[PDB]
Structure 1
Amino acid sequence: GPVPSRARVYTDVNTHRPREYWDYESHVVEWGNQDDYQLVRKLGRGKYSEVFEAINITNNEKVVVKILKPVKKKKIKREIKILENLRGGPNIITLADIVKDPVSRTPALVFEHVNNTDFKQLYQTLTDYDIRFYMYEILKALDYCHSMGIMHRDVKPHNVMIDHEHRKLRLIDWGLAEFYHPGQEYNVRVASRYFKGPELLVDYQMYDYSLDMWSLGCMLASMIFRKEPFFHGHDNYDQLVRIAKVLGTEDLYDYIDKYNIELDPRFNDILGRHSRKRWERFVHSENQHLVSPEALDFLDKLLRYDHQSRLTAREAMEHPYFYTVVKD
C-alpha cells in the first residue's frame, strides 16, 4: 500500500494542545445579535455561502457578512473554531461576530471589511516590489496558521484580499481549512483546480501544510510570468499533465514511487514523456521586469512534486527573493 507521510514541521502542534483546541465538533457557538447588521449589497455567491457588504449599526462600522448555505454542522463549527483560534494572527481575516440568519436558518459570519481591488485588475499593475511585498505578507499568514496546526487548503488569488491603498492584505475563506493531525487521511477534493497540489491530483490523502506552499507557488508563477492561471488544466487529469509538461515526468514517477502510489491508468494515453524545463523559457519582454534569478530560484523551490521537499513558509521567508522587501 501507500507509504505514510507526515509534515516536516509543526507535526505535533495539535496533540500537545488541549482537545478543545482542535475538537471542533464539540465547540459551542457564542451567538451575537443578528439585528446589529444591515445588508448593503451582495458581493458574491459561492458553492457554500453568499457574501454581503454590511454595516454594524451599533458601530457605524463597515463589515462583511457571509451567510452559509446548509452543510453538515461539522464543517460550520470547523470554520468557526479555526477563525477563532487564528484571530489576531498576522494577516488573518478577523471574525468579528456570529449570528443566526432568520431567513436562511443557518449561521452568518461577520468579518472585518477590507477595501480590496479585484485581483484581475490588481495583478495587471503589481510591480516586482509589490509582488515580493505581498508574497511576504501571505507567507506571514501561512506560517502563522501552520504554526497553529491548521492548513488553509484553498490558497488562490480570490482568497487573498488586498487593500492596495493601505498595503493591507488578509487571507480569507477558511471554509476548507482543517486541523493537521499526523497520519490523518484527508479529502483530496480541496483547493481550486489550478492550485491543486500533485498530492491531490494523484489521490494521496496523507498530505499536510505543504499543500498550501504548492498553491502559493502557483500564484507566484502567475504573477511573475503574467499568465493567470499558470497551470491551466481543462480538468483534474489535464491539470497534472500541464504540471508534468513543466516539471517533467521523470520526477513525477520518482514522486509516486517514493510514496508507493500508482497513477490512474487513464493517464496511459495522455501523460507522455517530458523533460524538466528551465524556468527561463517562460520569460519574455512583457514579464521580464517581474523576473529575477532570485524569483526563479524561489519559485523552483516551491513547485516540487514531493510535498516533503517544498520550502516551508518559514524557510520561504528566509529566501533572497525577499531581501529587497523592507521589513517593519
Structure 2
Amino acid sequence: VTTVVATPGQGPDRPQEVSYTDTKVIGNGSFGVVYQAKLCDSGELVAIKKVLQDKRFKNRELQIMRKLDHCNIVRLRYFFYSSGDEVYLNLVLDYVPETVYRVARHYSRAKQTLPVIYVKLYMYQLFRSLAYIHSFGICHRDIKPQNLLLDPDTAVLKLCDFGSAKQLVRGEPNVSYICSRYYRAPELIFGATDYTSSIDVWSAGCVLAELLLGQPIFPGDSGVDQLVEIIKVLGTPTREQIREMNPNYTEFKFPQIKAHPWTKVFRPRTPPEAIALCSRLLEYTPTARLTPLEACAHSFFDELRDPNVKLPNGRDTPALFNFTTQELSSNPPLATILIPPHARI
C-alpha cells in the first residue's frame, strides 16, 4: 500500500519525502496512465499521471504545469521519476471526482440534456482557463470534454492533460495533425502550420454544441471526413475563408453546400444566446472567432453574473470573478462586464 518518493513540487527547489497509498488505476490512454492515491500526510486525494519518452517529438507538459496557477486549471503538486521499459515520470496533480464528458454522458443515457446552468458554468470556466493560458501564449491543443475535470457539488471545472500543450510563437511552425479529431479546428484539417490559439476556441465551441446536442457535433471518421461533417453544418468554406485558414493551401472546389441554419442545428428548447455564442465560436475564419475573455463576456453567461444565482442544489456558485491582471491582459477594459457590481472590490 504505502509508497514513498522524493520530489521538488511547484513552488521552490526543495525535494522532499511524500508518502501515498490506496493507489488505484483510473485509466489508460494517450496521456499514459493516471492513478488515484491518498497522500499520507494530509489525507488528500491526488491524481498521478505517468508518461514518457524522448521519442522524436518535443513534449512540454512539465514546464507548462510548473508555470500555471489557476482555480480552473488542475494544479501540479509534485513530480518524481521512477521505475515501472524505460525511466518513468510522474506528475502529482489535484484529484477531481468527475469529467464533463462523464457527466454529459450520464444525462444522455437518461435521455436528458445537461441543464443550461451547468452548460454556462462549465463553458464559462473553460474559457476563463483558456484566457489565462492564452495570456501566456500557450495553446492547450486538445480541448475535449474528457479533459475537463469537474467537481459535481461545487460545479468547479479544471482543465487538464497539457501533454499536447505548446507555447506558440509566430514564425515558428507547429504540426497540423494535433487535437482530438472531433474537436480539431478546420485550419488543422487544411494542413495549416501557422495557426494561433484560436484552435482552442474552435474546440471549446465543439464542446458547447455537444453539451446542447447531447452528442458530438462533428464526429468524423477521418480528418477528411471531419471536414465533411463541419461543411454539413457550416456549409462550404469560401476563399478567403480557405485562405485565412491556410494561406499556402490552394485548390479546393468541392460541391457548394448551403449552411444549415443555426436554429435548426439544435433542439427547439435551446436558448438563442447559446446558439449565438456557438456561431461566434464555430467560424471558419480563425480571426472571426471570439477570444476566450470575449466569450466570458457573452450574454449567454449573464445569468452567472446575476446577484441571486445559486446552484440547483442551493450551494453558492464557484468563484467566477476573481480575475487577475494577467487574466485580463487580452482586454482589461472588458472587466466592467466580466465583474458584476456585487463582486467588485
Q: Which residue of 1 aligns with 2:39?
A: 56
- How far has the Cα of 1:72 moved from its partner? 4.1
CA deviation string 1:123-166 (max 9, x = no partner): 52520111011111111100000012211000000000111112
- How far has the Cα of 1:183 moved from its partner? 2.0
Q: Which residue of 2 aligns with 1:234?
A: 221
Query: What SS does the corresponding residue of 1:220 show, helix, strand or coil?
Result: helix
Q: 1:277 to 1:35 in 2, by over 3 A?
A: same
Distance (whole Å) between structure 2 residues aligned to residue 63 and residue 321 of structure 1? 34
Query: What SS does the corresponding residue of 2:114 show, helix, strand or coil?
Result: coil
1:194 matched to 2:182: yes
Q: 1:31 to 1:211 in 2, by over 3 A?
A: farther
Q: Which residue of 2 aligns with 1:82?
A: 64
Q: Quick check: 1:31–1:99 contact (8 Å CA) kept in 2? A: no
1:305 matched to 2:284: yes
Q: Quick check: 2:99–2:145 contact (8 Å CA) kept in 1? A: no
CA deviation string 1:214-252 (max 9, x = no partner): 0000011111122x2110111110000111111111x34
Q: 1:94 to 1:40 in 2, by over 3 A?
A: same
Unaligned stretches of 5+ residues in structure 1:
1-28
What letter is aligned with 2:298? H
Q: Which residue of 2 aligns with 1:40?
A: 23
Query: What SS does the corresponding residue of 2:62 show, helix, strand or coil?
Result: helix
Aligned length: 288
Worse-matched range after superposition: 138-147 or 179-188: 179-188
**RMSD, aligned CA:** 2.3
Distance (whole Å) between structure 1 residues aligned to residue 264 and residue 206 of structure 2? 16
Distance (whole Å) between structure 2 residues aligned to residue 34 and residue 100 of structure 1? 13
Q: Which residue of 1 aligns with 2:310?
A: none
1:324 to 303, 327, 333: 303
Larger RCO: 1 or 2 (CA < 8 Å, sep 6+): 1
Distance (whole Å) between structure 2 residues aligned to residue 252 and residue 315 of structure 1? 25
What letter is aligned with 2:201? M
- How far has the Cα of 1:199 moved from its partner? 0.9
CA deviation string 1:52-104 (max 9, x = no partner): 1112223322110111132349745x211001111x22311100001012225
Query: What SS does the corresponding residue of 1:219 show, helix, strand or coil?
Result: helix
Q: Percent identity, aligned pairs only?
A: 31
Q: Quick check: 2:185–2:199 contact (8 Å CA) kept in 1? A: yes
CA deviation string 1:186-224 (max 9, x = no partner): 011211000000110000010111010000000111111
Q: How does 1:135-154 map to 2 (within 5 A)?
A: 135-154=123-142
Query: What SS does the corresponding residue of 1:82 show, helix, strand or coil?
Result: coil
Distance (whole Å) between structure 2 residues aligned to residue 186 and residue 172 of structure 1? 21
